[PDB]
Structure formats: C-alpha cells, structure tokens
Amino acid sequence: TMEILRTENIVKYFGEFKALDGVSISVCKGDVTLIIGPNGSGKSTLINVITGFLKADEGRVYFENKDITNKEPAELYHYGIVRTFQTPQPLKEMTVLENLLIGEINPGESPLNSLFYKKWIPKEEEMVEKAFKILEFLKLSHLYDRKAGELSGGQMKLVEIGRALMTNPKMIVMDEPIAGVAPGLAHDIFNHVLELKAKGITFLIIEHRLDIVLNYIDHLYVMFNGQIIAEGRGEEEIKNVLSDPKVVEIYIG
C-alpha cells in the first residue's frame, strides 16, 4: 500500500498573503489522488511547489522517502515527477507528433523550455516509434500530422498528457484537465487515467469540484484557504466528504 509522495507542512506567501499554511499530504503507489477546492485556496500553488516551480517557504516533500524539497523541475524528471502543461501558442503551430516529440527534447521540463532547445525537430528513429505507440494508445493515432492548433479541447488535453508521457513517469501531475469540459469528455480524460494507472503510473490531479468522476477517485483531499479541510480515500469517505456540510458551503456560489 506504501506511500510514494508526502509533504511535511508546506507553506507559501505572495507578498503578505500566506497562500498555504503547512499543507501535508499522502500521495501514493498507483493511487489517483485528487485535490479539489474553490479558486483561491491555493491548489495550483501546492503544485508549483511540489513540482519545484514555486519554492516552499517552509516545509518538505518526499518521493520514495527522499527530500526533493525545492529541487528543480528538471531535477525531479529523474526522480519520477512530471506535469501537464497547457500547449503554448507557438507550439500549436506544429503537428501532434512533434508536440509529443518535444516531450523529450527536455523531459519533465516546460513545453516552452523544451521546444526552445529545438533548432529542428528530433525525428530520430526511437522517438518516432515511441511517440506513435503513445499516439495509438491515447486514441490519437489519426492525428499524427494534424497541426496542434486544429485540435479540439478534448483532442488537445490528451496530446498534453502524451507529451507528459514522453518521459515514462512514475507520477503525472494534472491541473484541472476536465475542469470546464462536457460530462462526456470528463470520463474520456479519466478513461486513459485508469488506462495508465493499470500501467504503473500514479496521478496527482486537481479539479475545482468533484461531481462526475467520483467512481474513479482512489483518494480525496479537500482544500480551503491553503489548508486541508477534509479527506476521503474511498467512495463513502469521499461522498460524505463532498456532501459534507461545511464542504458543500464553500461551493455555494
């Protein structure tokens, strides 16, 4: 059942505003950990911290029982950490394949800082084969040469998860992939989520609320104002924890 990632009271500040007041989690192996909370509670901050993007003012982060606190995102790549980045504008001007090919130009690193080491896209024998394999898996076989701009929101998010796949991570980090989408697509993003969970990959997803994908969740952790206000790790634990009075109040609006 072992744990794979645990923080030790993560704190953060943005001027005078303490965006995180010692956040301690329990991400683990093969689990589909989802952190939800209204906007402002610091959900995308705990992430930039866990990924190294934003520094921990005071606290720790352990992966495989190791201190990775404050390590560079480019450092974490070799530990097993990777994050799903929204595809940039100059990036949406290149095909789906290449958009995953760059996922290796710089692994565990920003699509910006990855493609910025690209003089001419790496059409090496192994990278092509690996990509196209991943393009079939994600059911995005038929779009290998479609510009990424021509991709719907749905077709897009999976090419972004593929880009993050082009490293072969032990854990992937997603910040609101279904947040906003139609219910048909919610299951779609999450479909592959279980298609990769059964391949040995651990997820750290983050959504505003948890409505549609409750039957997937392996572990829930709610957040309000930089802290953890409730937690479930089972269907009834989570249902109760969502339909928990104070927990359904912060979502009245």
Ligand X SMILES: Nc1ncnc2c1ncn2[C@@H]1O[C@H](COP(=O)(O)OP(=O)(O)O)[C@@H](O)[C@H]1O
**Which residues in the chain have their C atom more than 2.5 Å from the N of the next written residue, marking a break after them?**
28
CB count in 10 Å sphere of residue 18: 15
40 known member of a binding site: yes
Nearest to 192 by CA among 153, 155, 139: 139
Residue nearest to ligand MMC (CB): 28
Please work out the total of residues on this chain that contact ligand MMC, with binding judged by CB under 6 A.
6
In whole angstroms, the minimum distance from the beta carbon of 120 to ligand X comes to 35
The yes or no reply on residue 45 touching ligand X (CB under 6 A) is yes
Q: Residue 177 interacts with ligand X (CB under 6 A)? A: no
231 touches ligand MMC (CB under 6 A) = no
Q: Which of 66, 34, 68 is nearest to 51 (CA)?
A: 68
175 binds ligand MMC (CB under 6 A): no
Distance of alpha carbon 38 from alpha carbon 83, whole angstroms: 21
Q: Which is nearer to ligand MMC, 26 or 155 (CB)?
A: 26
Q: What angle do CA 168, 173, 176 make, to 5 degrees?
A: 135
How far apart are the C-alpha atoms of 118 and 127, rounded to whole Å? Answer: 14
Tokens of 14: 């943005």
Residue 172's H or E segment, with its range, is: strand 171-175
Question: Any long-range contacts for 65-72 (C-beta under 8 Å, 24+ apart)?
Answer: none
**CB 30 to ligand MMC: min, Å:** 9
CB of 196 to ligand MMC, least distance (A): 18
Q: What is the DSSP string of 30-83?
A: --EEEEE--TTS-HHHHHHHHTTSS--SEEEEEESS-B-TT--HHHHTTTTEEE
Q: Is 65 annotated as a binding residue?
A: no
Query: Is 169 assigned to a binding site?
Result: no
Q: Which 33-62 positions form the footprint of Mg ion (CB under 5 A)?
A: 43-44
CB of 41: closest distance to ligand X in angstroms? Answer: 4
Least distance (Å) from Mg ion to the CB of residue 20? 12
Which of 205, 164, 167 lies closest to 186 in space, CA to CA? 205
Binding range to ligand X, per CB under 6 A, among 38-46, 81-89, 113-121, 232-240: 38-46
Contact pattern from residue 3 through residue 42 relative to ligand MMC, giving x for each residue in contact according to CB under 6 A and a dash for the rest: x----------------------x-x--x-----------
The verdict on 25 binding ligand X (CB under 6 A) reads no
Enumerate the known binding-site residues.
Answer: 37-44
Give the binding site for Mg ion (CB under 5 A): 43-44
Give the binding site for ligand MMC (CB under 6 A): 1-3, 26, 28, 31
Give the binding site for ligand X (CB under 6 A): 14, 19, 37, 39-45
Enumerate the known binding-site residues for ATP.
Answer: 37-44
